[PDB]
Amino acid sequence: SHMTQEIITLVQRTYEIVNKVNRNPKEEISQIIQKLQKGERLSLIEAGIAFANDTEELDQILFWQARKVKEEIYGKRIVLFAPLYLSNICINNCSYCSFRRENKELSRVRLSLEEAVDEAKAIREMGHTRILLVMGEEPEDKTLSYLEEIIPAIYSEVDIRRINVNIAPLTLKGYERLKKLKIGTYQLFQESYNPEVYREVHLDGPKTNFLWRLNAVERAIEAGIDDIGIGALFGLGDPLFELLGVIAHADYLKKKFGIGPHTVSVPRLKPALNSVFSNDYKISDHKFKKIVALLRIMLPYTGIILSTREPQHLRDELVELGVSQMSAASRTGPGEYRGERQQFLLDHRSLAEIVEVLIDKGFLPSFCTACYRKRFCTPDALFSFVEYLYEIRDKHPELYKKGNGYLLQVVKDLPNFENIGRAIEYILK
Ligand SMILES: C[S@@+](CC[C@H](N)C(=O)[O-])C[C@H]1O[C@@H](n2cnc3c(N)ncnc32)[C@H](O)[C@@H]1O
Ligand code: SF4
Ligand SMILES: [Cl-]
Ligand SMILES: [Cl-]
Ligand SMILES: [Cl-]
Ligand SMILES: [Cl-]
Ligand SMILES: [Cl-]
Numbered sequence: 001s002h003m004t005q006e007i008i009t010l011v012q013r014t015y016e017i018v019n020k021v022n023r024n025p026k027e028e029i030s031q032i033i034q035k036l037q038k039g040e041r042l043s044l045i046e047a048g049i050a051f052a053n054d055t056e057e058l059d060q061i062l063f064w065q066a067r068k069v070k071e072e073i074y075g076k077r078i079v080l081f082a083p084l085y086l087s088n089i090c091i092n093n094c095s096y097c098s099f100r101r102e103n104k105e106l107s108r109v110r111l112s113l114e115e116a117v118d119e120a121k122a123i124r125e126m127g128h129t130r131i132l133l134v135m136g137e138e139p140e141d142k143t144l145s146y147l148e149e150i151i152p153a154i155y156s157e158v159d160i161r162r163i164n165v166n167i168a169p170l171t172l173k174g175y176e177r178l179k180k181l182k183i184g185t186y187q188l189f190q191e192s193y194n195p196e197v198y199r200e201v202h203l204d205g206p207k208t209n210f211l212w213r214l215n216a217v218e219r220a221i222e223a224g225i226d227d228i229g230i231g232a233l234f235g236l237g238d239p240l241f242e243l244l245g246v247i248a249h250a251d252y253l254k255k256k257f258g259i260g261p262h263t264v265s266v267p268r269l270k271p272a273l274n275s276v277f278s279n280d281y282k283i284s285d286h287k288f289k290k291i292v293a294l295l296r297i298m299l300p301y302t303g304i305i306l307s308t309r310e311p312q313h314l315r316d317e318l319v320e321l322g323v324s325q326m327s328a329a330s331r332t333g334p335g336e337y338r339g340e341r342q343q344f345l346l347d348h349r350s351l352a353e354i355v356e357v358l359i360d361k362g363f364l365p366s367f368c369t370a371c372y373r374k375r376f377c378t379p380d381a382l383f384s385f386v387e388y389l390y391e392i393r394d395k396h397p398e399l400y401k402k403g404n405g406y407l408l409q410v411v412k413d414l415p416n417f418e419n420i421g422r423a424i425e426y427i428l429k
Contacts, residue, residue, distance in 0.1 A: 002256050004215040010044075011193060011248045015241050018048035025053050036061045039068075044247060047294050051240050054286070066293035066321045069300050076410075077364045077381050079303075079325045079371065080351075081130035081164070082123045085334040086111050086150070088341060090136025092168075092205030094191075095277035096236070096269060098343045099136045101204065105274045107341050109334050116150050120158040122337035126329060126351045127388045129161040129367040132187070137168035137207065144170070144177050151181045162369045164229075168207070169216035175223030184369060185262055188216050189231025193245025197237035201277060217253070217261070227262045227373060228253075229305070234291065235269030235283045243291055247298050262373045263325060264295055265305040271345050285314055289321055296322025301372055309346055312354075316361045324371065328354045352396055355388075359406050379420055382407065386427055404428050 021028055032046045042050070050062060087110040093100045111119065123131060133151070135143060147167075154160055162184040169188060170178065178186065192198045195210050202208050217228045230249055232242040246264055254260040268283045295304055305325040306318060319326070329351040333341035358365050366381035367388055389403040407428075411421035 002252065004211065004218065004252070007214075007245070007248050007252050008193065008195065011241065011244045014044050014048060014244055014248075015238075017045055018052060018240065018244075021045070021049055022052055025049055029053060029055065029058055033058055033061055036065050039065070042298065044244065044251075047247065047298055048240055048244055051243055051287070051290055051294055059286070059290070062290065062293050062297070063321060066296045070296050070320070070322045070324070073300055073372070074324050075364065075376055075378060076362055077324070077366055077378070078319050078358060079130070079366045079369070079381075080128065080328045080355075081132055081162075081325065082126070082128045082337075083132040083134050083166075083307075083327055083330050083332065084116070084119055084123060084337070085134050085332065085343070086116055086146075087135045087138070088334050088343070089138065090205075091139075092137050092207040093203045094207065095201045095203060096233070096272060096275055098273035098275065103274050105340075109341060110146075111334055113150055113153055115335055117153055117157050119335065119337045120154045120160060124158050124160060127355075127367070127391050128329075128351065129159070129384070130164070130184075130369060131160055131162070132164045132166060132327075134166040135168075137205065140170055140174050143167060144174055147181060148177065151183065155182065161367070166229075169213050170219070172219050172223050175220045175225060178220075179224040183225075185227040185229050186217075186220050186225050187229030187231065187263070187265060188213070188220070189229075189233065189265060189267075190214060190245070190249070191231070191233040192236045192242060193232065193249070194237045194241050200279075201236055218256075221253075221257055221259075226259060229263040229265055230261045231265035231267065231305075231307070233267055233269055234288070235281050237281060239281060239283055239287060239291065243294060246295070250299050250302060260299065260302055263303040263305050264299065265307050266291060266295065267306075267308040270308055272343070273340055273345060288314075289317065292318050292322040301375075303371055303373075309344065312357055316358070316363070319358075319361075319363060352392060352399055356399060356402070359402060364410065378410075378414070379417065382410070382420065382424065386424055390427065400428075 028049055032050055035042055088099050089108045090099045093102050164185040165183045166187045198210050220228055230246055232246050250260050303324040304322050306323045331337050332344045355365050364381055366384045368380045368384035389400055393400045407424055
């Protein structure tokens with residue numbers, strides 16, 4: 001009944017309106033603040049104002065509400081996954097990325113079946129059970145055949161609970177082919193919802209098509225895939241507009257198919273190899289926290305993924321404010337887990353370390369999925385973390401003890417989970 005194009009019109013009008021409201025925001029701001037105190041639902045425009053304007057009261061109450069919501073739906077739970085880069089060759093040529101075709105400065109590698117499977121083994125040995133397959137864009141038949149041989153091989157040869165997919169837009173037939181591979185979630189980032197900056201930053205290849213990428217998730221849905229992931233690259237254009245666009249997009253999906261997006265991925269634009277993107281929008285840490293906050297409060301039952309590597313202190317603040325999924329010990333280059341290739345110029349950090357840090361900041365690391373996507377549910381996460389701890393009992397004993405103790409504390413925090421506590425203590429000797 002509706003078409004994707006409508007979104008861009010809406011978010012456009014909104015983006016205009018908000019900007020007018022930007023010069024007399026006082027009154028508006030006030031009412032918004034009240035809406036945040038009462039815990040009332042908030043609208044697109046008021047969200048726009050909430051982002052655009054930086055005042056002490058507004059930001060503090062916004063963050064407060066964000067933490068309250070994240071706690072109410074997700075608790076102290078943070079889901080961990082590792083991205084597996086299968087190939088860094090591509091047809092397209094965006095200004096911002098390292099994988100762009102005109103780069104030349106990049107070691108172009110595509111992984112054999114044995115190599116990819118070995119990468120899955122290396123990621124699994126770490127303790128990870130969730131993988132995000134990521135590739136540069138090749139022709140449809142190419143990539144889909146490649147994955148048609150690789151994904152079931154991973155499922156069978158390795159103990160991976162979920163394979164998520166970040167592959168360039170496909171045809172309906174292609175998505176019908178992908179649904180047969182039994183993938184978990186299909187993630188496709190719009191990168192930008194402004195056609196004027198989308199045209200600006202995407203220079204060569206099929207990605208130059210705005211609409212073909214915009215209703216890609218629609219095709220993914222109608223082809224039988226129910227779990228999808230939106231995303232918007234921040235720093236490409238005016239952050240207000242992209243933030244507006246994501247919420248409008250999820251809204252649209254919810255209205256059209258009755259199911260919203262499983263996850264919204266929010267990556268800020270990072271330093272790249274031989275990037276030629278000059279014009280920039282500096283995404284400040286504060287404003288970033290504002291984006292994840294507004295996203296958490298606007299789409300509460302929608303998971304939020306932190307794809308980009310962030311410093312610890314900010315990372316776990318973002319986890320506090322809405323983020324429900326995280327990339328830990330991530331390798332951003334194909335073939336490196338075993339094993340310049342990479343997409344980001346990164347100082348690899350160890351999974352056990354960040355699990356330690358997470359457990360000290362009071363967070364519950366998980367390796368399970370099935371969050372609330374089906375429609376507290378702590379048990380599944382509890383036991384995923386239990387399995388992790390048991391897997392690393394010999395690698396790091398002190399971490400095993402610390403983890404056990406933490407789990408005991410959480411278990412005593414909830415009286416409805418007595419038998420769960422007994423079971424957990426049985427499992428860990
Ligand atoms: C490697 S692409 C894989 C999927 C597919 N090639 C596509 O374009 O949709 C993964 C994501 O990394 C993000 N990315 C690319 N360059 C980036 C950069 N320089 N800084 C931050 N994120 C970037 C893009 O948003 C892209 O969707
Ligand atoms: S942005 Fe994605 S599709 Fe474009 S060159 Fe980079 S990896 Fe390939
Ligand atoms: Cl997921
Ligand atoms: Cl750090
Ligand atoms: Cl990382
Ligand atoms: Cl480790
Ligand atoms: Cl240790």
